[PDB]
Tab-separated table of N, CA, C and O in Angstrom:
chain	number	residue	atom	x	y	z
A	27	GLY	N	221.127	69.433	-4.635
A	27	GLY	CA	220.021	69.013	-5.401
A	27	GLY	C	220.604	69.112	-6.701
A	27	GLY	O	221.473	69.181	-7.222
A	28	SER	N	219.592	69.354	-7.417
A	28	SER	CA	220.145	69.739	-9.130
A	28	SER	C	220.961	68.410	-9.684
A	28	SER	O	221.884	68.848	-9.654
A	29	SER	N	220.533	67.490	-10.033
A	29	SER	CA	220.893	66.468	-10.746
A	29	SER	C	220.691	66.093	-11.898
A	29	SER	O	220.615	64.872	-12.255
A	30	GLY	N	220.077	67.302	-12.878
A	30	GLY	CA	219.946	66.593	-13.829
A	30	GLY	C	218.511	66.870	-14.253
A	30	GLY	O	217.675	67.393	-13.151
A	31	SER	N	217.695	66.533	-15.509
A	31	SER	CA	216.074	66.491	-15.437
A	31	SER	C	215.838	65.368	-16.532
A	31	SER	O	215.926	65.706	-17.926
A	32	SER	N	215.113	64.538	-16.049
A	32	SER	CA	214.800	63.551	-17.277
A	32	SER	C	213.652	62.648	-16.436
A	32	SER	O	213.066	62.860	-15.523
A	33	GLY	N	212.560	62.149	-17.371
A	33	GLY	CA	211.226	61.430	-16.977
A	33	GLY	C	211.535	59.792	-17.146
A	33	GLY	O	210.731	59.454	-17.539
A	34	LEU	N	212.507	59.538	-16.400
A	34	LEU	CA	212.782	58.154	-16.117
A	34	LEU	C	212.396	57.604	-14.629
A	34	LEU	O	213.467	57.773	-13.821
A	35	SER	N	211.572	56.818	-14.670
A	35	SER	CA	211.253	56.294	-12.963
A	35	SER	C	212.272	55.159	-12.902
A	35	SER	O	212.770	54.383	-13.554
A	36	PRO	N	212.985	55.262	-11.311
A	36	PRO	CA	213.673	53.856	-10.885
A	36	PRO	C	212.823	53.064	-11.011
A	36	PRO	O	211.577	52.899	-10.881
A	37	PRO	N	213.699	51.722	-10.591
A	37	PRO	CA	213.009	50.573	-10.274
A	37	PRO	C	212.168	50.382	-9.181
A	37	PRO	O	212.231	51.331	-8.246
A	38	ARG	N	212.000	48.893	-9.047
A	38	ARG	CA	211.006	48.578	-7.557
A	38	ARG	C	211.317	47.414	-7.395
A	38	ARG	O	211.440	46.516	-8.374
A	39	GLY	N	210.462	46.855	-5.993
A	39	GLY	CA	210.632	45.376	-5.410
A	39	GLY	C	211.964	44.857	-5.714
A	39	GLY	O	211.836	43.841	-6.359
A	40	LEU	N	212.982	45.717	-5.472
A	40	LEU	CA	214.441	44.846	-5.754
A	40	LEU	C	214.414	44.015	-4.361
A	40	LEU	O	214.704	44.575	-3.532
A	41	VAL	N	214.925	42.855	-4.458
A	41	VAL	CA	214.837	42.092	-3.485
A	41	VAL	C	216.543	41.224	-3.935
A	41	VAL	O	216.528	40.947	-5.159
A	42	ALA	N	216.851	40.451	-3.337
A	42	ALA	CA	218.001	39.576	-3.489
A	42	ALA	C	217.601	38.183	-2.639
A	42	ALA	O	217.478	37.936	-1.375
A	43	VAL	N	217.652	37.191	-3.444
A	43	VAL	CA	217.452	35.810	-3.141
A	43	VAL	C	218.559	34.862	-3.032
A	43	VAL	O	219.055	34.566	-4.303
A	44	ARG	N	219.233	34.454	-2.080
A	44	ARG	CA	220.409	33.936	-2.024
A	44	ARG	C	220.327	32.318	-2.372
A	44	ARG	O	219.315	31.316	-2.047
A	45	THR	N	221.347	32.000	-3.400
A	45	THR	CA	221.050	30.626	-3.919
A	45	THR	C	222.220	29.934	-3.878
A	45	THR	O	223.297	30.316	-4.079
A	46	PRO	N	222.167	28.580	-4.528
A	46	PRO	CA	223.332	28.011	-4.369
A	46	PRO	C	223.937	27.978	-5.625
A	46	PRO	O	225.406	27.937	-5.479
A	47	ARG	N	223.428	28.197	-6.695
A	47	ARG	CA	224.070	28.860	-8.136
A	47	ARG	C	224.508	30.133	-7.830
A	47	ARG	O	225.379	30.321	-8.310
A	48	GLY	N	224.260	30.875	-6.835
A	48	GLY	CA	224.240	32.436	-6.855
A	48	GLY	C	223.499	32.840	-6.034
A	48	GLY	O	223.085	32.417	-5.093
A	49	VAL	N	223.070	34.352	-6.247
A	49	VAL	CA	222.389	35.268	-5.652
A	49	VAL	C	221.625	35.579	-6.813
A	49	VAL	O	221.888	36.238	-7.650
A	50	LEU	N	220.017	35.508	-6.661
A	50	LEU	CA	218.988	36.033	-7.746
A	50	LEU	C	218.370	37.201	-7.087
A	50	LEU	O	218.101	37.228	-5.930
A	51	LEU	N	218.246	38.089	-8.094
A	51	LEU	CA	217.495	39.471	-7.711
A	51	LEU	C	216.383	39.745	-8.440
A	51	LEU	O	216.402	39.301	-9.560
A	52	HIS	N	215.449	39.964	-7.856
A	52	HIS	CA	214.153	40.399	-8.459
A	52	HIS	C	213.995	41.799	-8.300
A	52	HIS	O	213.801	42.444	-7.200
A	53	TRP	N	213.556	42.231	-9.299
A	53	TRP	CA	213.227	44.040	-9.315
A	53	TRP	C	211.777	44.022	-10.308
A	53	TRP	O	211.531	43.135	-11.212
A	54	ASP	N	211.586	45.274	-10.561
A	54	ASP	CA	210.365	45.423	-10.992
A	54	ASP	C	210.740	46.865	-11.942
A	54	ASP	O	211.578	47.569	-11.926
A	55	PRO	N	210.149	46.546	-13.515
A	55	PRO	CA	210.371	47.360	-14.511
A	55	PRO	C	209.539	48.993	-14.176
A	55	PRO	O	208.602	48.939	-13.607
A	56	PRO	N	210.601	50.095	-14.471
A	56	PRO	CA	209.847	51.434	-14.338
A	56	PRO	C	209.081	51.632	-15.162
A	56	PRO	O	209.033	51.814	-16.705
A	57	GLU	N	207.427	51.774	-14.670
A	57	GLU	CA	206.191	52.185	-15.615
A	57	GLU	C	206.681	53.639	-16.169
A	57	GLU	O	206.222	53.520	-17.180
A	58	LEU	N	207.222	54.320	-15.650
A	58	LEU	CA	207.452	55.342	-16.383
A	58	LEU	C	208.914	55.465	-16.961
A	58	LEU	O	209.925	55.539	-16.204
A	59	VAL	N	208.775	55.800	-18.146
A	59	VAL	CA	210.058	55.578	-18.813
A	59	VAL	C	209.744	57.077	-20.543
A	59	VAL	O	209.043	57.188	-20.749
A	60	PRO	N	210.943	57.312	-20.487
A	60	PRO	CA	211.195	58.550	-21.378
A	60	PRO	C	210.646	57.957	-22.920
A	60	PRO	O	210.665	59.071	-23.590
A	61	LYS	N	211.105	56.947	-22.985
A	61	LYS	CA	211.049	55.884	-24.221
A	61	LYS	C	211.440	54.635	-24.277
A	61	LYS	O	210.371	53.630	-24.226
A	62	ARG	N	212.474	54.526	-24.077
A	62	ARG	CA	213.185	53.112	-24.263
A	62	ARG	C	214.388	52.991	-23.096
A	62	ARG	O	214.870	53.730	-22.858
A	63	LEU	N	214.105	51.538	-22.529
A	63	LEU	CA	215.232	51.379	-21.597
A	63	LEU	C	216.476	50.822	-22.241
A	63	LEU	O	216.589	50.459	-23.005
A	64	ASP	N	217.546	51.683	-21.628
A	64	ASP	CA	218.804	51.385	-22.135
A	64	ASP	C	219.730	50.079	-21.409
A	64	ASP	O	220.332	49.052	-22.199
A	65	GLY	N	219.268	49.794	-20.105
A	65	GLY	CA	219.718	49.066	-19.269
A	65	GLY	C	219.979	49.480	-17.515
A	65	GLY	O	220.118	50.676	-17.781
A	66	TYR	N	219.865	48.447	-16.771
A	66	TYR	CA	219.884	48.822	-15.320
A	66	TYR	C	221.352	48.657	-14.911
A	66	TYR	O	222.122	48.027	-15.575
A	67	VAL	N	221.703	49.027	-14.045
A	67	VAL	CA	223.076	48.773	-13.377
A	67	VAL	C	223.178	48.564	-11.705
A	67	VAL	O	222.466	48.930	-10.913
A	68	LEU	N	223.606	46.879	-11.486
A	68	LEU	CA	223.256	46.374	-10.315
A	68	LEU	C	224.594	46.671	-9.763
A	68	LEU	O	225.721	46.545	-9.947
A	69	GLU	N	224.259	47.144	-8.591
A	69	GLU	CA	225.243	47.408	-7.611
A	69	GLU	C	225.270	47.122	-6.234
A	69	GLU	O	224.092	47.275	-5.343
A	70	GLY	N	226.203	46.241	-5.771
A	70	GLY	CA	226.164	45.272	-4.638
A	70	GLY	C	227.222	46.048	-3.639
A	70	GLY	O	228.496	46.485	-4.250
A	71	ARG	N	227.490	45.379	-2.581
A	71	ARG	CA	228.605	45.512	-1.881
A	71	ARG	C	228.545	44.626	-0.569
A	71	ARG	O	227.341	44.423	-0.139
A	72	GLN	N	229.675	44.476	0.419
A	72	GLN	CA	229.405	43.844	1.522
A	72	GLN	C	229.327	44.884	2.465
A	72	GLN	O	230.002	45.645	2.903
A	73	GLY	N	228.480	44.429	3.359
A	73	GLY	CA	227.985	45.269	4.550
A	73	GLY	C	228.151	46.572	4.167
A	73	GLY	O	227.188	47.432	3.491
A	74	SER	N	229.582	47.292	4.768
A	74	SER	CA	229.560	48.768	4.574
A	74	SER	C	230.737	48.942	3.559
A	74	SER	O	231.708	49.539	3.897
A	75	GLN	N	230.831	48.131	2.603
A	75	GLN	CA	231.948	48.085	1.896
A	75	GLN	C	231.904	49.148	0.725
A	75	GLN	O	230.538	49.852	0.357
A	76	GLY	N	232.631	48.995	-0.523
A	76	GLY	CA	232.662	49.763	-1.476
A	76	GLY	C	231.657	49.617	-2.598
A	76	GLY	O	231.574	48.232	-2.905
A	77	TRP	N	230.568	50.267	-2.842
A	77	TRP	CA	229.876	50.092	-3.772
A	77	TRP	C	230.281	49.631	-5.245
A	77	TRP	O	230.920	50.352	-5.722
A	78	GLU	N	230.222	48.143	-5.273
A	78	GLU	CA	230.941	47.951	-6.674
A	78	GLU	C	229.775	47.179	-7.826
A	78	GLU	O	228.956	46.674	-7.194
A	79	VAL	N	230.006	47.910	-8.811
A	79	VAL	CA	229.203	47.779	-9.673
A	79	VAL	C	229.114	46.281	-9.940
A	79	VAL	O	230.129	45.949	-11.119
A	80	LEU	N	228.181	45.301	-10.147
A	80	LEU	CA	228.354	44.066	-10.635
A	80	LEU	C	228.240	44.253	-11.970
A	80	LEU	O	228.633	43.214	-12.512
A	81	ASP	N	227.025	44.820	-12.479
A	81	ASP	CA	226.888	44.822	-13.920
A	81	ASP	C	226.286	46.263	-14.129
A	81	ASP	O	224.857	46.219	-13.625
A	82	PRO	N	226.613	47.115	-14.800
A	82	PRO	CA	226.298	48.320	-15.172
A	82	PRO	C	225.199	48.135	-16.400
A	82	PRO	O	224.357	49.096	-16.487
A	83	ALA	N	225.468	46.823	-16.898
A	83	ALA	CA	224.700	46.921	-18.344
A	83	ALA	C	223.979	45.437	-17.929
A	83	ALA	O	224.168	44.608	-18.140
A	84	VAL	N	222.774	46.065	-17.965
A	84	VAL	CA	221.541	44.837	-17.319
A	84	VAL	C	220.397	45.239	-18.395
A	84	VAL	O	220.099	46.293	-18.595
A	85	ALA	N	220.108	44.253	-19.053
A	85	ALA	CA	218.599	44.216	-19.804
A	85	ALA	C	217.698	44.939	-19.410
A	85	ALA	O	217.281	45.083	-18.485
A	86	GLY	N	217.175	46.101	-20.207
A	86	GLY	CA	216.391	46.941	-19.830
A	86	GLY	C	214.978	46.399	-19.842
A	86	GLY	O	213.866	47.155	-19.417
A	87	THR	N	214.886	45.329	-20.311
A	87	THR	CA	213.588	44.367	-19.884
A	87	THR	C	213.626	43.173	-18.997
A	87	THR	O	212.513	42.945	-18.617
A	88	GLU	N	214.706	42.959	-18.379
A	88	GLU	CA	215.439	42.063	-17.357
A	88	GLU	C	214.653	42.367	-16.151
A	88	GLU	O	214.375	43.597	-15.707
A	89	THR	N	213.867	41.390	-15.434
A	89	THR	CA	213.203	41.713	-14.233
A	89	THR	C	214.210	41.005	-12.861
A	89	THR	O	213.535	41.156	-11.775
A	90	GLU	N	215.179	40.707	-13.431
A	90	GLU	CA	216.212	39.646	-12.261
A	90	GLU	C	217.508	39.248	-13.212
A	90	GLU	O	217.678	39.550	-14.060
A	91	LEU	N	218.539	38.727	-12.028
A	91	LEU	CA	219.557	38.679	-12.462
A	91	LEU	C	220.642	37.660	-11.363
A	91	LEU	O	219.929	38.081	-10.160
A	92	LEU	N	221.348	36.991	-11.718
A	92	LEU	CA	222.106	36.295	-10.813
A	92	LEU	C	223.411	36.818	-10.468
A	92	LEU	O	223.938	37.196	-11.463
A	93	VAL	N	223.690	36.778	-9.058
A	93	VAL	CA	225.012	37.340	-8.764
A	93	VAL	C	225.838	36.392	-7.760
A	93	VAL	O	225.471	36.622	-6.554
A	94	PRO	N	226.623	35.495	-8.422
A	94	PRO	CA	227.183	34.607	-7.462
A	94	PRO	C	228.342	34.970	-6.924
A	94	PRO	O	229.301	34.384	-6.086
A	95	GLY	N	228.620	36.059	-7.451
A	95	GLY	CA	229.717	37.035	-7.077
A	95	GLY	C	229.783	37.317	-5.612
A	95	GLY	O	230.085	38.777	-5.085
A	96	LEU	N	228.987	36.820	-4.627
A	96	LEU	CA	229.028	36.828	-2.810
A	96	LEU	C	229.975	36.172	-2.171
A	96	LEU	O	230.466	35.139	-2.480
A	97	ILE	N	230.313	36.892	-0.955
A	97	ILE	CA	230.969	36.013	-0.229
A	97	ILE	C	230.143	35.500	1.058
A	97	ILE	O	228.983	36.241	1.551
A	98	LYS	N	230.343	34.230	1.619
A	98	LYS	CA	229.799	33.879	2.926
A	98	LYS	C	230.143	34.638	4.203
A	98	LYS	O	231.271	35.567	4.212
A	99	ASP	N	229.574	34.328	5.089
A	99	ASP	CA	230.099	35.319	6.649
A	99	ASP	C	229.555	36.777	6.261
A	99	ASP	O	229.936	37.092	7.094
A	100	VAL	N	229.174	37.329	5.251
A	100	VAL	CA	229.600	38.574	4.883
A	100	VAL	C	227.600	38.876	4.565
A	100	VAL	O	226.540	37.774	4.397
A	101	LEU	N	227.424	40.173	4.324
A	101	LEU	CA	225.688	40.278	3.797
A	101	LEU	C	226.180	41.230	2.645
A	101	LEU	O	226.060	42.758	2.781
A	102	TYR	N	226.156	40.882	1.513
A	102	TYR	CA	226.320	41.536	0.236
A	102	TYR	C	224.843	42.801	-0.164
A	102	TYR	O	223.786	41.841	0.083
A	103	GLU	N	225.195	43.561	-0.466
A	103	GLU	CA	223.912	44.429	-0.796
A	103	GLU	C	223.690	44.532	-2.242
A	103	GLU	O	224.305	43.926	-2.919
A	104	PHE	N	222.663	45.296	-2.483
A	104	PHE	CA	222.346	45.177	-4.122
A	104	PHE	C	221.404	46.707	-4.306
A	104	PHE	O	220.682	47.196	-3.401
A	105	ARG	N	221.731	46.847	-5.528
A	105	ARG	CA	220.879	48.485	-5.840
A	105	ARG	C	220.738	48.372	-7.708
A	105	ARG	O	221.746	48.378	-8.031
A	106	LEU	N	219.366	48.511	-8.139
A	106	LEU	CA	219.434	48.600	-9.303
A	106	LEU	C	218.793	50.018	-9.662
A	106	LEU	O	218.152	50.508	-8.947
A	107	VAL	N	219.871	50.459	-10.688
A	107	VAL	CA	219.359	51.896	-11.148
A	107	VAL	C	219.241	51.954	-12.684
A	107	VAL	O	220.185	51.598	-13.503
A	108	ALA	N	217.603	51.977	-13.037
A	108	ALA	CA	217.252	51.982	-14.288
A	108	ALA	C	217.965	53.365	-15.243
A	108	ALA	O	217.994	54.578	-14.330
A	109	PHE	N	218.168	53.058	-16.300
A	109	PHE	CA	218.859	54.232	-16.973
A	109	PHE	C	218.760	54.520	-18.510
A	109	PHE	O	218.764	53.354	-19.290
A	110	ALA	N	218.280	55.656	-19.356
A	110	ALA	CA	218.067	55.484	-20.681
A	110	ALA	C	218.789	56.743	-21.201
A	110	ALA	O	218.853	57.878	-21.288
A	111	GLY	N	219.809	55.827	-22.335
A	111	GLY	CA	220.791	56.846	-22.755
A	111	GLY	C	221.405	57.635	-21.973
A	111	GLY	O	222.249	57.276	-20.638
A	112	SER	N	221.082	58.831	-21.822
A	112	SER	CA	221.718	59.944	-21.099
A	112	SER	C	220.812	60.187	-19.984
A	112	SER	O	221.391	60.504	-18.833
A	113	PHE	N	219.554	59.623	-20.270
A	113	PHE	CA	218.916	59.659	-18.584
A	113	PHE	C	219.070	58.582	-17.775
A	113	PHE	O	219.357	57.414	-18.323
A	114	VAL	N	219.122	58.654	-16.645
A	114	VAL	CA	219.375	57.882	-15.729
A	114	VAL	C	218.131	57.735	-14.529
A	114	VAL	O	217.662	58.793	-14.507
A	115	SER	N	218.346	56.848	-13.548
A	115	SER	CA	217.345	56.673	-12.642
A	115	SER	C	217.518	56.172	-11.858
A	115	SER	O	219.329	56.076	-11.432
A	116	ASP	N	217.176	56.721	-10.330
A	116	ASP	CA	217.852	56.408	-8.876
A	116	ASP	C	217.877	54.752	-8.740
A	116	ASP	O	216.942	54.102	-9.024
A	117	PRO	N	218.833	54.331	-7.963
A	117	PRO	CA	219.066	52.902	-7.570
A	117	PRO	C	217.908	52.710	-6.502
A	117	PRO	O	218.023	52.759	-5.402
A	118	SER	N	217.142	51.772	-6.983
A	118	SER	CA	215.816	51.251	-6.538
A	118	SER	C	216.198	50.603	-4.909
A	118	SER	O	217.646	50.613	-4.578
A	119	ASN	N	215.300	50.413	-4.148
A	119	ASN	CA	215.703	50.369	-2.959
A	119	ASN	C	216.949	49.148	-2.622
A	119	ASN	O	217.056	48.798	-3.764
A	120	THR	N	217.557	49.447	-2.098
A	120	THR	CA	218.749	48.338	-1.716
A	120	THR	C	218.424	47.000	-1.150
A	120	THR	O	217.573	46.883	-0.370
A	121	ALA	N	218.848	45.847	-1.795
A	121	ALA	CA	218.432	44.590	-1.308
A	121	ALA	C	219.850	44.013	-1.079
A	121	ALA	O	221.177	44.198	-1.254
A	122	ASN	N	219.519	43.317	0.214
A	122	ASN	CA	220.565	42.632	1.332
A	122	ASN	C	220.482	40.867	0.834
A	122	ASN	O	219.060	40.480	0.958
A	123	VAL	N	221.547	40.192	1.258
A	123	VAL	CA	221.509	38.727	0.909
A	123	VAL	C	222.305	38.257	2.128
A	123	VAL	O	222.859	38.805	2.651
A	124	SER	N	221.577	36.877	2.621
A	124	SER	CA	222.121	36.559	3.605
A	124	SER	C	222.810	35.092	3.428
A	124	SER	O	222.633	34.299	2.181
A	125	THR	N	223.687	35.204	4.241
A	125	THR	CA	224.356	33.747	4.037
A	125	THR	C	225.248	33.177	5.313
A	125	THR	O	226.567	33.028	5.561
A	126	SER	N	224.111	32.704	6.349
A	126	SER	CA	224.884	31.982	7.357
A	126	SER	C	224.644	30.493	7.542
A	126	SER	O	225.161	29.694	8.236
A	127	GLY	N	223.444	30.112	6.778
A	127	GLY	CA	223.096	28.775	6.978
A	127	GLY	C	222.823	28.126	5.368
A	127	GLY	O	222.322	27.226	5.453
A	128	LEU	N	223.049	29.210	4.443
A	128	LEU	CA	222.758	29.046	3.091
A	128	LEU	C	223.346	27.698	2.702
A	128	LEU	O	224.349	27.239	3.300
A	129	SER	N	223.029	27.121	1.572
A	129	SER	CA	223.712	25.571	1.421
A	129	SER	C	224.269	24.659	2.447
A	129	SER	O	225.101	24.496	2.795
A	130	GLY	N	222.852	24.643	2.778
A	130	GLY	CA	222.808	23.330	3.940
A	130	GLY	C	221.626	22.868	4.493
A	130	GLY	O	220.650	23.093	3.750
A	131	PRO	N	221.581	22.145	5.972
A	131	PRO	CA	220.356	21.368	6.127
A	131	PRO	C	219.462	22.415	6.618
A	131	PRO	O	219.859	23.361	7.419
A	132	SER	N	218.282	22.454	6.287
A	132	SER	CA	217.007	23.182	6.817
A	132	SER	C	215.700	22.867	6.467
A	132	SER	O	215.760	22.372	5.387
A	133	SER	N	214.666	22.716	7.324
A	133	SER	CA	213.558	22.312	7.058
A	133	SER	C	212.397	23.483	7.291
A	133	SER	O	212.140	23.585	8.332
A	134	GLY	N	212.129	24.296	6.067
A	134	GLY	CA	211.451	25.119	6.051
A	134	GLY	C	211.969	26.699	6.864
A	134	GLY	O	210.946	27.674	6.812
């Protein structure tokens, strides 16, 4: 335990919607903030690969982001962790993306 001490709540409603232009991620802003948000950090990875920092610098007001840097036939994960200056927050729930039938024929 003992991983510091800050009053910054992590994000929520973290999801990943695979799109043709890339992958859209939807999250929620941390109602609990010590003051102002510095920005979040999008961390994804394939299946059980190394957590790759997609973008550690994410608008502290943004509620989503695009990540076309995904691979097919794989399942890229995601995790947003809000942080305020010296303060940081835990990486909201993990977001998984699918790409087995993406960009193709489908009716509903």
